[PDB]
Design a protein around this motif. Sequence first.
Motif, short mmCIF file in Angstrom:
data_model
loop_
_atom_site.label_atom_id
_atom_site.label_comp_id
_atom_site.label_asym_id
_atom_site.label_seq_id
_atom_site.Cartn_x
_atom_site.Cartn_y
_atom_site.Cartn_z
N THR B 674 0.82 -1.21 0.00
CA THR B 674 0.00 0.00 0.00
C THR B 674 0.86 1.26 0.00
O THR B 674 0.65 2.16 -0.81
CB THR B 674 -0.93 0.01 1.21
OG1 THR B 674 -0.16 0.12 2.41
CG2 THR B 674 -1.74 -1.27 1.27
N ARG B 675 1.84 1.33 0.89
CA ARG B 675 2.63 2.53 1.05
C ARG B 675 3.82 2.59 0.10
O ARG B 675 4.57 3.56 0.13
CB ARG B 675 3.11 2.66 2.49
CG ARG B 675 2.04 3.18 3.43
CD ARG B 675 2.36 2.85 4.87
NE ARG B 675 1.59 3.64 5.82
CZ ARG B 675 0.35 3.37 6.20
NH1 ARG B 675 -0.32 2.35 5.68
NH2 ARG B 675 -0.23 4.13 7.11
N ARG B 708 6.33 -8.10 6.54
CA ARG B 708 6.12 -7.01 5.58
C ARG B 708 6.89 -7.23 4.29
O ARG B 708 6.40 -6.92 3.20
CB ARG B 708 6.55 -5.70 6.21
CG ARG B 708 5.77 -5.29 7.42
CD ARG B 708 6.37 -4.04 8.08
NE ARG B 708 6.91 -3.06 7.14
CZ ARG B 708 8.20 -2.83 6.93
NH1 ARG B 708 9.13 -3.51 7.56
NH2 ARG B 708 8.55 -1.89 6.05
N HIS B 877 5.15 3.46 10.87
CA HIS B 877 4.97 2.76 12.13
C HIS B 877 5.67 1.41 12.10
O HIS B 877 5.65 0.70 11.09
CB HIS B 877 3.49 2.57 12.40
CG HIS B 877 2.75 3.83 12.69
ND1 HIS B 877 3.39 4.99 13.07
CD2 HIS B 877 1.44 4.15 12.59
CE1 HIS B 877 2.50 5.95 13.25
NE2 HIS B 877 1.31 5.46 12.96
N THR B 878 6.31 1.06 13.21
CA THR B 878 6.94 -0.25 13.34
C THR B 878 5.90 -1.31 13.65
O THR B 878 4.76 -1.01 14.01
CB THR B 878 8.02 -0.24 14.41
OG1 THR B 878 7.51 0.37 15.60
CG2 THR B 878 9.25 0.49 13.93
N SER B 879 6.31 -2.57 13.52
CA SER B 879 5.40 -3.71 13.55
C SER B 879 4.84 -3.89 14.96
O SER B 879 5.57 -4.18 15.90
CB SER B 879 6.12 -4.97 13.08
OG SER B 879 5.19 -5.97 12.74
N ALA B 880 3.53 -3.68 15.09
CA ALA B 880 2.91 -3.68 16.41
C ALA B 880 2.74 -5.09 16.94
O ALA B 880 3.26 -5.44 18.00
CB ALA B 880 1.57 -2.95 16.36
O1 U5P Z 1 0.18 0.87 11.35
C1 U5P Z 1 0.59 -0.42 10.89
C2 U5P Z 1 0.45 -0.48 9.38
O2 U5P Z 1 -0.72 0.13 8.88
C3 U5P Z 1 1.71 0.24 8.90
N1 U5P Z 1 2.30 -0.31 7.67
C4 U5P Z 1 3.54 -0.86 7.78
C5 U5P Z 1 4.21 -1.39 6.76
C6 U5P Z 1 3.64 -1.40 5.44
O3 U5P Z 1 4.15 -1.85 4.44
N2 U5P Z 1 2.39 -0.81 5.41
C7 U5P Z 1 1.68 -0.26 6.44
O4 U5P Z 1 0.58 0.21 6.23
O5 U5P Z 1 2.67 0.11 9.93
C8 U5P Z 1 2.09 -0.57 11.07
C9 U5P Z 1 2.60 -1.98 11.10
O6 U5P Z 1 1.57 -2.92 11.37
P1 U5P Z 1 1.42 -4.24 10.49
O7 U5P Z 1 2.78 -4.86 10.78
O8 U5P Z 1 1.30 -3.75 9.05
O9 U5P Z 1 0.26 -5.02 11.08
#
Ligand code: U5P
Lengths: 182, 1629
Positions: B674-675, B708, B877-880
Amino acid sequence: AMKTPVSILQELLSRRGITPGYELVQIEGAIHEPTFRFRVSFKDKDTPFTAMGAGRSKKEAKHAAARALIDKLITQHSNKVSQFHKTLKNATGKKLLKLQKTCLKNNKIDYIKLLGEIATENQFEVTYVDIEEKTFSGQFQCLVQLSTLPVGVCHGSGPTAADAQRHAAQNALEYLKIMTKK
Amino acid sequence: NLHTTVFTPRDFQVELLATAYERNTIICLGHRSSKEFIALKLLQELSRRARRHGRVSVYLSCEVGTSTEPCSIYTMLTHLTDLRVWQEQPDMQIPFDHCWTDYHVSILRPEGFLYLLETRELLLSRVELIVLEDCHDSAVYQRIRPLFENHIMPAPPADRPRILGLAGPLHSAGCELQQLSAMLATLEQSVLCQIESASDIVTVLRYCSRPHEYIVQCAPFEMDELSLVLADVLNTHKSFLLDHRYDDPLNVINSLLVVLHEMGPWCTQRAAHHFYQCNEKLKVKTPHERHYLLYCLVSTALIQLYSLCEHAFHRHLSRQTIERYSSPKVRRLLQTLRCFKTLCALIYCNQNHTARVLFELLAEISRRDPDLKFLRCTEPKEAELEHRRQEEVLKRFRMLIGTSVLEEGIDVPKCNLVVRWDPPTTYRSYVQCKGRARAAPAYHVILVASTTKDLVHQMAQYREIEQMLLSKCANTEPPEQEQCEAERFSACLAAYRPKPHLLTGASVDLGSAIALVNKYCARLPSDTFTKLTALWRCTRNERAGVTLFQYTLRLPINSPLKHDIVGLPMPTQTLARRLAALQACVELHRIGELDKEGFRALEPDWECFELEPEDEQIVQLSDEPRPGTTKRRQYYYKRIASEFCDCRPVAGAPCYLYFIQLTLQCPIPEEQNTRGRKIYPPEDAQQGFGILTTKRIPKLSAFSIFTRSGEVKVSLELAKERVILTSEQIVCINGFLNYTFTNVLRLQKFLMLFDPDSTENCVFIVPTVKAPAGGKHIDWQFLELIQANGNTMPRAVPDEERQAQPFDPQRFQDAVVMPWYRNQDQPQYFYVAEICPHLSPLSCFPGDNYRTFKHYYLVKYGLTIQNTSQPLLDVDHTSARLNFLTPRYVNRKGVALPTSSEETKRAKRENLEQKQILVPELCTVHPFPASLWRTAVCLPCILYRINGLLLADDIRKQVSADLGLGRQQIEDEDFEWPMLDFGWSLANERQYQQTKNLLIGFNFKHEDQKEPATIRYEESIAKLKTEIESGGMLVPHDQQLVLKRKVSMMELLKQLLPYVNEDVLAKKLGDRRELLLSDLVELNADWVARHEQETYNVMGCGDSFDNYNDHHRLNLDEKQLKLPAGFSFDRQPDLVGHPGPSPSIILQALTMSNANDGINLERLETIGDSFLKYAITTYLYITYENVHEGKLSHLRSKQVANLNLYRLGRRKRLGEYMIATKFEPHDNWLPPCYYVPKELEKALIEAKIPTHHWKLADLLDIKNLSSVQICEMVREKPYNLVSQHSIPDKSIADCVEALIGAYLIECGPRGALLFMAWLGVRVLPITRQLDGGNQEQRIPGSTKPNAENVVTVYGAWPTPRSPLLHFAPNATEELDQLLSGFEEFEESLGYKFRDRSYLLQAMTHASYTPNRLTDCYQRLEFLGDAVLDYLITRHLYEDPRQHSPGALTDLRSALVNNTIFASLAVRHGFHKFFRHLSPGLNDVIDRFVRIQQENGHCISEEYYLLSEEECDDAEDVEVPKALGDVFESIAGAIFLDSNMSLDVVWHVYSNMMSPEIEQFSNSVPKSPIRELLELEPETAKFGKPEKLADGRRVRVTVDVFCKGTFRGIGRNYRIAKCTAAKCALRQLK
RNA sequence: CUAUACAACCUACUACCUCUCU
RNA sequence: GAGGUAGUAGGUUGUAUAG
Ligand SMILES: *O[C@H]1[C@@H](O)[C@H](n2ccc(=O)[nH]c2=O)O[C@@H]1COP(=O)(O)O
C-alpha cells in the motif's frame, strides 16, 4: 465525552505526555460465556496504575477496565332431527294429545283438515303432492311434506286422488302421533 | 414374543420346492407369484445338472405366443438368473442363429414342444425338466394328452425328465368332492406326478397344533309387539314403494329387513344409524327432484323406526334390556372367550366396517362387563388418518378383529382362539382364518349365522379334502399319542446340566431340547427376509423286530456348527426328535454356543481397558461431560522442548551457536504494498540474531514466516567453532536479553522476572554480526554499546546542541528514528521509509490550522527548530503485533483476500495529509539498526515454530525409542526434512390376476366316464358324517358348547431300547440308575458292535438338497459322529534405517484447527480414523474366526470409540505436545529466561483488590519459594495462558487418529499398525520371546527388554483359516458343483479367485440352506465394510483439490452408502448370482433389477422410481439392502484372497466405482433435498405420506409454490421425499 | 456420524467516519 | 497509531430440524 473511555483517557493523558499500554491478562474459557479480562498498565515506571476489567466483550472488558481505573482514583342426525321436532311438538299445543286420544282407523275425522289445523297451530304449512301418473295397481298416491327444517315426507295411497291425500294425511297423523306419547 | 415352536417350521415355498426337488410333483398353491419363485428356483437348481449332464430344461405355459411382449416369467429368468432363457414370439419364425441346444431354459407352447418331440428338434432324454403352467386346466390337459400319452408314458422312467405342474389349489378344482377325487387320481396317473400340497393351510392343519372346531348354529327370529309394529310399518312402506312412480331404496329395504329378522329392534335402530347417515347425504347429493323425494321418504321412514325404537326402552321403562329384545346369539362365543381367561383371540370377517364395529362391540363389553376387563381391546390425509386409526386399533387389540387382508403374510403371536362369525362359503379363506390358533390347546369357532345336513356334508367335504391334502403330501406329522408317551417318559428323567456339580444350572432334557434348538436358530444374525430353520430328516430301521427311527438334525448355515447332529434310535418319531435335539444341545455346549455385549475378547488387554484412577471416577460420574468428548477440556502444560531445557550457557562450558538464518523467497505484492516502500531482504542485515545453547538441536525443517517483506524462510545453522563464555560476557548477554525482550519488542509484561540461571526455558539469544572479512560471529562491540546504552531515558536535547550539530544522513539512514519530544515513558519507534531532501521545516503544511512545519513545532510544543535547512523524514509505524506465521492476504482455502483500491493507493501515496514527516534534530537514533529491527521482530514466531517442530521431533524420538521406529536421536548432518508448507498457494396387476384366479375361476375338469362313487368314497363320507355328528365336531342346536382343557428302570430300558437284553445291562449298569447321553452312545456303540450290519430307509421328505454330510457315500457313516504407481493404499516403505515421519507432518497432526494456522490435523485425522477402523476390522476377523459379525462389530466399537483414543492420548500425554491457540507474542508465549506463577490466578479473581498495594515488588519470587509460602503470600491479601493451553478430549482423540494417519502417510500401513500398538490398543500378535543376542539392535516392533531381558516382538497378520467346512466327504466337489455359473460373475467383476470358498461365502445369503460348505456373507460384509471405507477415504484424501473436513466427509458419506453399493452391484449383475431361497427378497431384488434395466443400466440412484409424468405410482422400486451387503461382502472376499492386500481390491473397484467418484466429486451437487432447500429456503415442504393398497409402497408429495406439486413414491419415507425433491429439481431445470 | 438455519466470540482483509500524528 | 460502522474470509462453542 460519550464514547469508549479507553480512547477518552488515552487522549486525556496524551495531552499531558506519558504513553499507556493495555494488555490482555486472561481470556476466560467458560462453556458458553468465554469472557475476556484486560488490564491497563499505566506508567509502570513511576506510580504504576494497573487496573483490571471484566467483560464478555473486549470493548466491554476494556470499558470496564477504564471505568475501574477512573473509579479507584475518585343416528346422531336422526337424534338431531328428533329433538327439534320435540321443540316443535311443545310448540304445537293441544291437538297432539287429541291425536293420541283418538283412533286413526276411523275416517270420520278428516285427516287433511286436522293436519291443516296442526299447520295453522304450529306456524308451518302442509304440502300435498299427488304425482300425475298411475301405478301398476292402477291407483293413486300422495306425499305430504312438513314445511319445517328437515325434508319431511309421509306417504299415502288410495283408489282415488282424494283418498290418497287423506291416507297421506293419516300417515302424517300417525307420524305426529308416534313422536307425541311419553 | 417367545415362539416356543414345534419342530422347525421351514419356508413353505421352499418346503414345496424341496418336494419338487425329490420327486415328480404337482404343486398345490394358489398365488402365481410364489409359484413363479418356486419355478425359478427349481430351474436354478436343475441348471447345474443340465450343464454337467449336457441337458436342457423346458417350461410349458399357456398365455405364451399370444401377446407380443414377453411373459413375466421370461423377464424374471432373463433378469434374475444367469440362464440362457428364450422367448417364443406369437407365430415365431425360427431365426438361423437361435437354438435350443444352446439355450438353458426354453419357455414353449405345449403344441410347440409337441411339434419338437415329433420332429426330433428336441430330445426327451436331453430334457431334464418339464414344467406345466396351470395343469389343472382341462384344456391344457387335452393339449398335453398327445404329449404325455405319446411320449412321456412310452419313455422309460430312467429316461423320463423330472415333471412339475404349477397347479391351482385342490379346494379350487371346480368339481364336487367325488369327481374331485376322481379327477385327482386320473391326474396323478396322467402326468406321472403326485400332489404335494404344503400350503400355509396345510402348515397349520399338520405342522401347527390342531384347533378343535366348534360349530354353533343361529336360530331364526319372530316378532314381539314392538317388532310387530316395526314389521307392519316396514311392509306398509315396501308395499307403497313398489307402486311409487318415476316414469337404491331397495338396498335400504333389503338390508333393514335382514337386520330386523336376524338381530332385533336395538340393532335395527343401530342400522338405521348407518342408513340415515347415508340418506342425510344422498338426499342432498341427488339432482333429480323425484329421486330426492324418494330418498327423503325413505329417510323419514328411518326417522319413524328410530323414533319407535327410542320410544321402546328409554321411554316405556341395561344388559337385561339388550338381552330382552335382541337375541342372545353371541353367548356361546363369549363363553368360549371367557374360558380362556396367553390368549390372543382373533375374530375374522370380510368387511372392514364389520371389523370396526365388532372392535367397538368387544371394547364396550370389555369396559361394561367386570369379568371381561381382561380383554384388551389426491387428498391423502384421510387415508393416513384411517391407517393410523386402524393400526392403533390393531395394537390395542393384539397386545384382532381382522378381515381378508390378515390372512396371508401377516405375522402374529400364537393364538388360543380364532372366530368365524361369517359362515364360510370358501375353504381357502376358512382355513386361512383357522390357521392362527396354535397355542396347544387352541380352539376354532364356526358360527353359522336339511340345510344343516347339507352344511354337514360340506364340512365333510372340507375334512375329506383335508385328508387328501395331508395324505398325499410330503413328510407328515406324528400323532399326539407319541407326544403323550413322551410326556409320560420325561416325567422322572432328570435334565442334563452344563456343570455336573451345579444342580441349579441350565436344566435341559428331552422335554425342552427342541425349544432350545429353535431359540438358538432364531437368535442367529438375520434380517426380515431371512427365515433360519433346521432341516430334519427321519429314517426307519428295524432292531429285534421292533421299529426304531433315526433323526438326523441339521442346524442353520449361520451357526458355527457345520456337521450333522445324528440322533440315536428311539421307538417312535417324537422321542427320536427330542433325543436328536438334546444331542444337538450338548454338541453346541461342547463348542460353547448356548445363549454382542455378551461376547468378550480372547486376549487380555482387549478386555482390560485400564481406566486412569481419577479418570475412572470421572467416567462413573455421568453428570460431568464425558471423557473422549469435545465438551470436557483439560489444561495441559506447553512443553518447552528437550533441547531447550537445562541448556543454559554457563561460564567455562563450550557452547553450541546457531545462526537464525532468514531468507526472503517471495517479495510482497504491489497490490499488498500500500505505502509503496522499498523491499528489504532480511539476509542483507549485517546484524542478525543467534541462539547460544549447550544441548545440540537436531536436524529441523526450514519453515516459512510472513512479514512485511513477504514470505521469509527460517532455518537454523550451526557455527563450527564453539563459544566459551566468561562471567562478564554472561552479564552483558543477560543485559542484552533483558533489553531486547523488555524494551525493543516490549514482550516483557507484568509478573515476569528475568532469571538467567533457570533450569527450564533457559537459552541465550545474542546479537550476531556478519564478519567484515566473512562469516558471522557474536558482535562484541555491539554488546558493549548495549552495556553503555542500557535503559537510558531519551533526552530532550537543548537548542545549543541542535545548533551545534549539522544533519548527517547516514546517522538517520537505515535506523530507528524515535522522537524525543513525544512519548517519554513508552517511546514510539519509527522506521525510516524515505528521507526527503525537498521537504524542510519551512516546507508547506498539509493541514489548515498550522502553516509550515517549523511554525507547527513552535506552536504545539513551544520548541524552536534551530536548523530549518535540514531535510525531513517520511517514516512508518513499526510492527505492532509480532505474529507473522499466517500470510496476511490469503484465506484458508488459498483464495486471495481483496486488496486495496488503486485510488486509495495512489491518493494516499503522495498526499501530505497521510504519511508521517519528522525533523531529524527532533529525533533520537535508537541503537538498534533497522534491518536488525526487522529480524528482531521476526524472532518470536521463529522461536514458537522451532519449539513446535522440536515437540514433534520429541514424539518421533519417543516412538523410535520405545518401539524401534527409526533413529533415536537423528543427529546426522547429511539429512533434511520436508519444508513446512501450509498448502496455501500464494407386477401388482399380476398379483390382482392371481387373486382373480383364486377368487372366481377355480374351475376345470377332465373326465367323468368312469364310476366315481366307488363306495369307499361314500363310506368315507358316511364315516366323516358319523364322526362329526357324534365326535362333538357337530355341536347341535340344543347342545350348547364344549370348552374342555411304574415300570422297572431296566424294563423301561427294554421298552425304550428294544435292542438290549435284561441281564446284560444288569451287570453293565451296576450302581447306575439311568443311562445318560454318553452312556446311551456307548450302549448304541456296543449294539452296533454286537450287530455289525445296519439298514436304513428314506422316510418323508428329509430332503435330497444337502447330500454328502447325510447321503451320497451311504457307507456305514450312519449312527454316530464319525502397489499402483498412480498412488497406492498398501504402500509399504522399509522400516530398518527409515528415519520415519518428518516432524513437519507430526507437528501438522499435533496442531489443531483452533490454532488458526495454515496446517491442520483434520485431513490426517480422517485418514487416521479410517485406518483405525480398517486394521481393527481385519485383525478382529482373523482372530475370532467362528464368531459371527455382531460381536466383532461390538469389539471394534469398543476399540475405535474416542473415549479409548482419549485414554491412549492421556497415557502418552499428547495434550502437552499440541498447539491450541493462535500464537500471539504478547499473551501466550514465554520468552527465554522468564517464569509465570500458576496460583496467583486464584489470587487474581477478586480477593486482592481494595486497591493495588503491591505493584509486584513484594512478591519478588514465587518459584523459589515453597508452596506453603505460595499459599501464604496468596492469602496475605482458570488456567495459565503463557505456558498452558486448554485442549478438549475429543481433539486429543483426533490427534491420536491424525498421528496414526501421519505414520501411515510416511511409513506405511505396517508402521501405522506398529504405532497403533504404541498407543495401547493391540492390533498385532505379541510373540514374547527371550533375548535376541544383541539388545542394542531393535528389529522394528521389538520393545525394550525388561528386567529379565525379554523382547515382545510384534508379528504380522496371520492367514485366517478358510471356512470350507470339511464335515462332508467331498466338500470340495460339492463346492465345485454348488458354485456353477460363477465364472461369468467373475468376468463381470474381474478378479479370479484362488479359494472359491470365499466366493461362495460372499454369495450365500443367510437363508440358502442347501449350502453346507461355507457360512453366510455377514463376516465378509463386516470385513468389506471397513476395507471399502479405508479405500474410499484414502482415494479421496489424495485428491489434489485438497478437500476440507466437511468436503471430504461429504464426498465419502455419499460415496459410501448402501444405495450406491446396491446400484453398482446391480449394474454389473451382482443380483444374477446371489443364491437366496428367500421369497420376499426375490421379489424385492426382481422388481428392482427390472426397473434398473428399464433405466438401461445407467447409474441412477434417483431417476428410476419417479416421474410425475410416468404412471409408476402403483408399485414403486425397492432398493435391496442385501445386494449392498453383497457388494461389501465380495469386497471383503477379494481382500482376503489377496493375502490381505488392498491394491488388488482397488484395482478391481476402480472399474466399478470411479465414474460415480468423478461424477459426485467434480461438481458439488449438494444434497438433493438441500439443493431444493437452497433454491427456495421458505417454500419447499414435504407433507405426510400415504400407503397405497398394493402392500409395500409409500407416496409422499413435495410442493413448490408457483411451480407445482410433485408427487412421489418409495418403499421408505426417505426415498419418496428425496425423489420428490429431485423431480421438482428436474422440472425446475 | 452427515446436511441446513440462528446467536456469540475471534482475528486476516477492504472501504469509510471519530480523534491524534503529519 | 487509537476508537467506530459496514461488507468479505476463516473458524470455536451452543439451540432447533431431518437422514
Ligand atoms: O500501522 C501499521 C500499518 O498500517 C503500517 N504499515 C507498515 C508497513 C507497510 O508496508 N504498510 C503499512 O501500512 O505500519 C504498522 C505496522 O503494522 P502491520 O505490521 O502492518 O500489522
